[model samples]
Structures are given as structure tokens and as C-alpha cells.
Target: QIPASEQETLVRPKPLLLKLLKSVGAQKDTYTMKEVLFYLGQYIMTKRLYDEKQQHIVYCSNDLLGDLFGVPSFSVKEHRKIYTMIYRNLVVV
Candidate 1:
């Protein structure tokens, strides 16, 4: 049977998402998936907050947010929620 830690790793990035991220190094902070997703998700939650602070920055950033495979797209809120779900495993308590 699979161990819990093993299960954790298995739980990451959904197989398809991992392939796309690995294919393009979306995991890189240089590309900064979590960091970028931060603002993207924020924008979805509060458009005013985004418009006030992050909208211009995120738009200007021009970094690929979620293209691990074909036709990748996500609202900022979805990005953050997914990141929290997937990447929380990578975090150290």
C-alpha cells in the first residue's frame, strides 16, 4: 500500500498539470507560479483590490500563468485556490 508521504507527492499538480509545468518550468519562481497565481487569484476575488493594486502589475508581468498543456486558462481566484490545494503539500509546517 502507498504511504501517506508517497500519497502526498502523488497528489501534486494533477498528472496533466505537472506535465505542462515540467515541460515549461512553470514551477520556477522565475516564472513564479505561486507568486503569479497570488495576484491572479486576488484579482478574481476583489476586482477593486486588483484594480487598485495588482491589475496593472499582473497584466504587465506577461508571464504564463497556467499553461502546462493545451488551452490552459484559470481565473485568478481559481489559480490561488488550486495552488493552495496542490502546493500546500510542499509547505513545511
Candidate 2:
């Protein structure tokens, strides 16, 4: 697998979604799209944390993803759809 820090979104896409996650993770009050995209690329390529259940390096989740990137669908309950979609695809089981 490639290092988290070396991952490039340009090769993988999801530039906007990854960017937002990165911006929120760093707790930076304000961030540019370029900054977030770059940071996210770095995080995915090189970063890892031990998962208590798996006993190995695993990525994490952000609860704020739902609130931050909610879809503008008719159903209000679908607010978390984007969050679920992103996490489900990005994280390893």
C-alpha cells in the first residue's frame, strides 16, 4: 500500500470530500480547497492509528461529516447519506 502522506487525490478523485474532512480534522477555522486537498492526500498516504478491535493500523471517522456535507435531498432523514457513503468507501473493514 502507498504511504498515507503520499496519496494523491488527483489520482483517486473525491477531491472535495477529502478536502472537507482534512479541513475539519486539523481544526483549522478556515481552510482553502487546495489546502484541504493537499492535507487529505498526506493523511491518507502516511497516517495510521491503532484500532483497539483490529489491533492494527486503521483509519478513523468524523461525526461531523454528516452535518458538514449533507445532501440537499427531499428527505430530511437522508442528511447522513453522504457521510455514510464516504466513510463506507474510504475505511477498511
Candidate 3:
């Protein structure tokens, strides 16, 4: 998977979502998205965490994800909705 660093956001089409997540994660004083992504990667590779497709959202071990990043539940649907709202609302003329 492609990494979602600030530089990555500057160069890609869907960078908007990544940028929004990074910002909200900061504004809310929560974990950094980069670190969260790294933790998510760890869980994915370890096999102890199983990823459910479609309805569930992004793959992660909920307990581990919460412990590692402090997100209540890092579901993609929730995140996507957040990203959309943040990005749309914050864009300046």
C-alpha cells in the first residue's frame, strides 16, 4: 500500500482524504495518522487481526487500534464521512 505522508498527499489524487485525516487527528489532539497507519499495517501483517470487507470499513484490530492510537473505532466509513466533512468545510476560497 502507498504511504500517506504529507508529501504523498501533495502528489496524489485521493490525497484529500489522507490530508483531512491527518489534520483532524491533529486538531482533535488524537494520534497522528502516520503512526496510526503504521500500527494498522502491523496488525494487518500479524494475522491476529482479520479484515472484513465492504460493510465493516477499514481493517484493524479494534482493541489494538484503540490502545495504539486512541481512536474509539477506526472504521473507514466513519473516517470517510469525517474526511469529507472536514475537507469540504475547511477549504478556503
Candidate 4:
């Protein structure tokens, strides 16, 4: 039997996204979408940016996050849209 080849989607982060990833100790020239999301989630949790009353909402506590997400606050339920926003900050490889 022939073995199937593994496929991996890699992407490079733009300046803004790079800054965010770096802040979360995930410095890398290229990353997978999963990796990017993991780092971003870490940053949000580390900064305690999620709303207390509504965990579904996340606040932009800094200029970097605010500019990247382009909002003062956003609901996690819009995560699919957020992924689209993140893609805008990355170069698919």
C-alpha cells in the first residue's frame, strides 16, 4: 500500500500579527493556522482581555490588539470572522 503524503498549511504573519505572536513568546518566521490561533489565544488569556460578565466578549486592551482586531471589543462567537481578520494579517505559504 502507498502511504499518503502529509499536507501542512503554513503562513507568514504580517507586522501587526508578528508583534502579537512575539508578545506571546511564539516568535517564528512561518506558522500554521493552528499555531497562530494558539498563540493569539494565549495572549488574550495572559492579558485577561475576556469580559467578566460575558466570556464570549473579548476586549482590546492594547494598541496592537485593538488595531489587529479593529475593535474595542468583539464576541468570540464571531470567531469565524475573526479568523478571516487574522488571515488578512498573514501571507499563506
Candidate 5:
């Protein structure tokens, strides 16, 4: 962690961000529940960093960051279950 010879570098447009957007093939206003879960699973596996709020979130990015479900509507049961799993796991972690 003490190496100071390779710390100054910057790239325009941010290539990794573009790659993530391209991987999901986003093209709709409402992605299915299965799609959101799948995307979250993928990010959890490959992403380099995770924070308190983002460690388990879907991080829906479209139209200026979508909601947890990546859609505007969903059943109460679905929301309850997803949040339960998220908080329960976060607490344990």
C-alpha cells in the first residue's frame, strides 16, 4: 500500500461503467423482477467495492438511478421479502 509511483491516472468516459451498462442489455422502462435479482446477483459477485447501503442493493441505473425493484410497482409481499433478506444478511455480516 505504500507504492506511490502508479497513483495518478484518469480515463475519460469511464470504460468500466460503460461495460456494466452494456452487460445487462438495458432497453426497457420496466425490467422484470427476475431481471433485477439477476443483475444484483451479478454485481455482488464481480463488483470491486460495497458499502452499507450498496452491499446488497440492486443499484438500478436508468433514467437517473431506478428504484430497488427497478420498476415503479410491485406486490407488498415481494418488497417485504426482499428487504427482509437484505437487512437480515446485512445484520449478520
Candidate 6:
């Protein structure tokens, strides 16, 4: 049996997150957290949003990202915090 935390479940994105995912060509009815993060990573990498000086920091250069994260920049060091932020955008089942 898989651990509860290891179990992957389908989750629908909130309107704000849906918009951002759509912009990144990840339009979908549902997704697992892993999938969402994958797309998010792709978007950030493709846009070169990661701070050069601090690899752990990412700048919210896009309006959609800024709206969702509600920040101008964030650090990956706050990894769990980032997870919480993304989880907020998902309708967990």
C-alpha cells in the first residue's frame, strides 16, 4: 500500500490557476500536484524567471504569476510554503 502522502489524486485548478496553466499550454480539467508543478517549472524555466544571482529565487515577472503567488518574488528555500501556495489554487478531492 502507498503512504497517504505518496498517493496521487486528481485535483482541479481554481480559476486563477487555470488561467496561468492555460497560458503555459497546460489546459486540463484535472491534474495531480506533480503535474501542476511540472508545468509551473516549465513556465518559469522557459521564461527565465529564476534569479541569476540567487538560483533559489524566482521573480514573478508575469502578471498571472504575480496574481496567483501575490508576490513580486519568492524563494525556493520556502519549498513547503510554495507547495502550500500551489495547493491553495487546487480544488483537492
Residues 1-93 of candidate 3 have per-residue lDDT tens digits of 233443123211123334433443322323443344443344444543434554344333355334333345444445554343333322222
Residues 1-93, model 2: lDDT tens digits: 324443222222244454555553654434443344455445443543224455323334442333333432222233244234444324221
Model 2, global lDDT: 0.39
Candidate order (lDDT)? 4, 6, 2, 3, 1, 5
lDDT of each residue in 1-93, candidate 1, tens digit only = 323343223223444434434544345422234433443444334433233454433221232333321223333444344555445333322
Clashing residue pairs in candidate 5 (N, C-alpha, C atoms within 3 angstroms) = none
Error of 6 at 54 (Å): 1.8
* Clashing pairs counted in every model: 4, 7, 0, 0, 0, 0
Top candidate, metric lDDT: 4
lDDT (0 to 1) per candidate: 0.37, 0.39, 0.38, 0.78, 0.35, 0.77
TM-scores, each model vs. reference: 0.24, 0.26, 0.28, 0.82, 0.28, 0.81
For candidate 2, the TM-score is 0.26
Badly placed stretches (over 4 Å) of model 6 are: 1-7
RMSD of every candidate to native, in Å, equals 10.6, 12.1, 10.3, 5.7, 16.4, 3.3
How high is the lDDT of residue 2 in model 4?
13
Model 4, 35-91: lDDT tens per residue? 887898898899889998889888895657888877888887875677777888888
Question: Highest TM-score: which candidate?
Answer: 4
Candidate 3 whole-model C-alpha lDDT, 0 to 1: 0.38
| Model 6 agreement with the true structure over 48-86: per-residue lDDT tens digits | 889887778998856578778878889877766777778
Q: Cα lDDT of model 6 overall? A: 0.77
Residue 88's lDDT in candidate 2 = 38
